[PDB]
Each structure stands twice: as C-alpha cells, then as structure tokens.
Amino acid sequence: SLPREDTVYIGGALWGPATTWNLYAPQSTWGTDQFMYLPAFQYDLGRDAWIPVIAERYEFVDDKTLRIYIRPEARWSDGVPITADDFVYALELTKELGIGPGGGWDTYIEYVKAVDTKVVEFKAKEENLNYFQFLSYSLGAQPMPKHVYERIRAQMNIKDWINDKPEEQVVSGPYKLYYYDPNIVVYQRVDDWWGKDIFGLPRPKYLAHVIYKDNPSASLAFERGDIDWNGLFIPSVWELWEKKGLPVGTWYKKEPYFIPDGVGFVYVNNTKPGLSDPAVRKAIAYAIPYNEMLKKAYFGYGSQAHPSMVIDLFEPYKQYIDYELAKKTFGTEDGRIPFDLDMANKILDEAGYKKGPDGVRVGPDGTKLGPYTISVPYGWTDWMMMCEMIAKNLRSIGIDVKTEFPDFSVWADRMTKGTFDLIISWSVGPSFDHPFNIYRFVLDKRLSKPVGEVTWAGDWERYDNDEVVELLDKAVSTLDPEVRKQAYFRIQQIIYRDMPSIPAFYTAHWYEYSTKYWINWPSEDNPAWFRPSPWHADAWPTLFIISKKSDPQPVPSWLGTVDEGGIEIPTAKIFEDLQKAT
Ligand SMILES: OC[C@H]1O[C@@H](O[C@H]2[C@H](O)[C@@H](O)[C@H](O[C@H]3[C@H](O)[C@@H](O)[C@H](O[C@H]4[C@H](O)[C@@H](O)[C@H](O[C@H]5[C@H](O)[C@@H](O)[C@H](O)O[C@@H]5CO)O[C@@H]4CO)O[C@@H]3CO)O[C@@H]2CO)[C@H](O)[C@@H](O)[C@@H]1O
After folding, report:
1. Which residues have any ligand 1 atom within 6 Å of their CB?
2. Please, what are the domains in the chain?
3. DSSP letter for each residue of 439-465
C-alpha cells in the first residue's frame, strides 16, 4: 500500500499495541511526542546548543524572567496560529491533571503567562531558585492546541481521549497519524507544515512501524531490508555488514558500535515489604553480575554505571563525582560496585535476615524476602537475559526473585503505577544539566505519584527523602559550580546509604540503519545529529538529514551554531545572556 521508496520503515521503537496519540493519557503511542508535538527550542546534545523551533528567539527581562518569542509562521496543522495561550494551556493542564508534558514545572516556575499573542513569559520560582530547571521548562516548553483540548474536554474526560482520527488530528510537527491496526502504525508527512520554508520538509512521506513481537522477528525483517531505521538490540551486530554483506550500519563501525543513551537501573520498589529496607537494596547491588552480564547478555554494547549516577563516559562530568567517597564505600579502583556475593550475604546477615528452611531469608519483623518478580518487556531479549542472571544470583543469597516478561503495555503500566517489585528500566542521559537531571528524575518524590497512579515524570520506585528535595532546591540557586558540586556530593552519600535504586549500566543508544533506500544517516563519519535513534525524544532532525538514494538532497542549512552558519544557539550564549540580565 505504501510507496517503498518514499517510506521509512522503523523497528525497535514501538512495542505492544498502539494506545493513544494523547500526551495526557496514561499511555501514548511512539511517534506522538517525537514527531507530532514540537518544542519551543530543541536541545542539541551533540552541539550543546538549542535549535529555535516553534520559538524564534528569547529575551531575558531579568535573570529570573524569560520571554520566548513564537515564530509568526508557527501554526497548528488545522491553520490556527500557535500562540502563547497554547503554552500556558499545556502546562496548566499538566498541573491540573497530574500527568502530561512538562511534569514538575510548577515546582521551579512561578508562572507561565501570555504577555502578547506570540510572546510567552516564564518566571523562576525564587524560594527554591533553580536556574537549570528554569531554562529546561521554559526553552523546552511544548505547546498543545488549546482550541482542540477545550473541545475534547466538553465531550469527555481528556485522559480517555484517544486522538486517533487522522483527519481530526491537530499537530505542530511535520507528521501526523495516517493509519494503524494491531500490526502497524503509520505516519504521513504534513506537506503544508508551518515550518516548511524555514526547515524544509522531512524527506520521507511515510513513517511506518510494523509491530514486531520480539527482537528476533524484528532482526529478521532488518536483515531482509524491510527496516530502514532501527533502534533494536542486535546480537553480534557487526556480522550484518562484515559477514552477511548487508547494506547496514551503526554510529560506530568498531566497538562499542553505539553511543550512550543514559543510565539503565535495576529499579527496586521502595514500597514493597523487604524491598523497603535499604540493607536489602544494598545487598541486591552487590549481587548483580555486572561484568558477566554486560559481556554475555549485552555484547559489550555498554559498560557498568558508576553508582553516583553520573555518566563518567564524558570527561567534563567527572568533576561531579566524589571518587574518594565511592572508592572508600565500595573498595574498588573507581568506586564502582563490585559483584560480590560474600558481601551481599554479609549485608543481609548484619541486617538480621536469616534463611528459612526453604533458603529464603526472613527479617526480624517476620518479613520474608519474596516472592518477588524482576520484569522487563517481552521480546527485549538482552534485558530478559540480564534479568535471568540477576534473579539467579538473588535467589542464591535468599531473595526469592523470578523473572516475568509481560507485554510492553502491561510492563509500562506496572512500572509507572509502582506495582512492580524489581525491573530494569531507563532514566535520563547526558545533558546540559547532568547530573542534576538524573537526581531529579530518579530521586525526587515530587515527581512521583502514589502507588496505583501513573507517573512518567520520575521516581518510579517511590523513593521518599526530603533532604534530597532540599538539596535539589539549592543545587542551582547560583551558577557557581561548587554549589552544584557540593549538593551532588551529599546526594551521592545519600544514594550509597539508601540505595534507592541501582544504577547498573550505561544504556546503548540503539541505532542501526539500512542504506538500501535511504542515505546520509548520521554516524561517526557524518555526525549531523547526535540523537538519531528512532525512539529518542529528540530524533526528529534525523528525518531532515537523510534523503532518498534516488533523489539525494543537501544537508539542512539550519544545522550548526549561528556562528557556523546555522541557527542553533550555544548553551554558553544562553547563560551569558542570563548573567547579563542580573
Ligand atoms: O535494550 C533493551 C531493549 O531496548 C528496546 O529500545 C528501548 C531502549 O532500551 C530504551 O532506552 C528506549 O527508552 C526511551 C523510550 O522509548 C522513550 O519513550 C522514553 O521518552 C521519554 C522522553 O525522553 C521524555 O522527554 C518523555 O518526559 C515527559 C514525561 O513522559 C512526563 O511524565 C512528564 O510529565 O513530561 C515530560 C515531557 O516534558 O518521557 C518519555 C517516557 O519516559 O525515553 C527513553 C530513553 O531514551 O526505549 C526503547 C524502546 O522503545 C529495543 O527496542 C530492544 O531491541 C531492546 O531489547
């Protein structure tokens, strides 16, 4: 049905059935955030700069008051101008519903206000001034169509709205839904997209994602040429081009093949009996076979995470790690947690957990350490294998854990609602505000929700610590890096004490491409965009960079900093402007 040469087929981004195209619903479908609803500015991790997208510029009124100027051209796909009211609406709705884009904004932002039709004003909250969050929530603000949502709300509960009618869909991005069924989701380019003159059009007319059940089936499709843009775990991926002579590639031609995405955690639900004990969580950390599982299950595609949660793959981040503390605590050369069952057993012994007749430990208050599950989505074979290795080792120390692999949608439900025991899941990655971003996402009770209520905003494990809140509130009250560092250092002490959840490995930014129909994919040799994975929040520029093999097009002129000839604003410039405005 779809013209092959005008379609990008995608793998590894959509797992389980389509759900909704509504960012205020408990679940939405891959492609909704990525391609349908764009931000004011798009952060460019690769260049540490910001693309003015829906916004054309900003101006600091003072260091705590930021105006964002919406492009005159920015217009919803139904013809209605994108206006400041749309920005206010999106954030106020998220606050009202307790779910939706920009969760947590009202903690660090005093107000968002429409000061003119095309001018939004954001004011930082002074009591707990945080310059990083001020910038994140403002520059990265996503508008949502007020005139559409107020309509839906008169008809039904917004949380129940599916938004699955292609003709009726109102979007700010260059794609909208075209067709879906239990086996596929397809998006079609919006040819009269508001951004067509400033950004050009993305090259593919259709984005199609067949819903594969597992990694092997998606891999089989990729090998035969039926997937152009892949975000999959693939065993021995180099064999695809080395041995099988396929026209496929990755970011790196050599080991490790993938750039890093962020931090993969073993999340441990703090609300569960047994798992609520810091001692038990610490024992679990020592029982994970880091090296062996990353070699065998993960094919060396990523390495062990530092327990500080800081991504030490990047030199500039190391200054934020208290290495002496980590080394002292864990007894290793760099402060990484060793795989040490003797230690895991000792920790449990000293916390008064004694093995019963069935070999499962029982605490002093009579709490048995099990039964528990460790769970990841069905078909995610690398994580599944990890889970088996972890579960076996936990069983050996007297924590009764068995693996369970439900459909993605069910897994996500249990994760977001905090009804899981153990899971492997993602967190956040490198960014201008790292590692504040990861402490905020993983440790901040303010982003969590009660057990039974969905949160995608953070703290799935329902960790609850008020000192961490205080530290986050003061960490960026000034831009002095020492203030930041000292807060991070104390947070690290708290992490090692409480083991709220376990940073385990640096997740791979899964990204493979076929050059059969589509060329000029980003890579080490063509590093045009540093977040090209099809599931990544920030993937969209990839679609403007590639072109048809039979109709090659030039590099987008807007990529690059202003000084280089593009339109991107370096982060340093934004901070300069902020400081100027004091
Ligand atoms: O290796 C195992 C397995 O991987 C399958 O590829 C996985 C990959 O491993 C995961 O890392 C990748 O995780 C990304 C998710 O796909 C994506 O949905 C999640 O998008 C974030 C987004 O970054 C964030 O901005 C969005 O914040 C909003 C919150 O949702 C709201 O709660 C809050 O209120 O408002 C903000 C908006 O301001 O949240 C979403 C959801 O977390 O980003 C993840 C990390 O990049 O997922 C891939 C699967 O799709 C691979 O396919 C298998 O082959 C392999 O076995």
Report:
1. 12-13, 15, 100-103, 215, 231-233, 261-262, 380-383, 426, 456-457, 507, 510, 535-537
2. 1-36+156-189+202-254+509-556 (3.40.190.10), 37-155+190-201+557-582 (3.90.76.10), 255-508 (3.10.105.10)
3. HHHHH-GGG---TTS--SSS-TT----
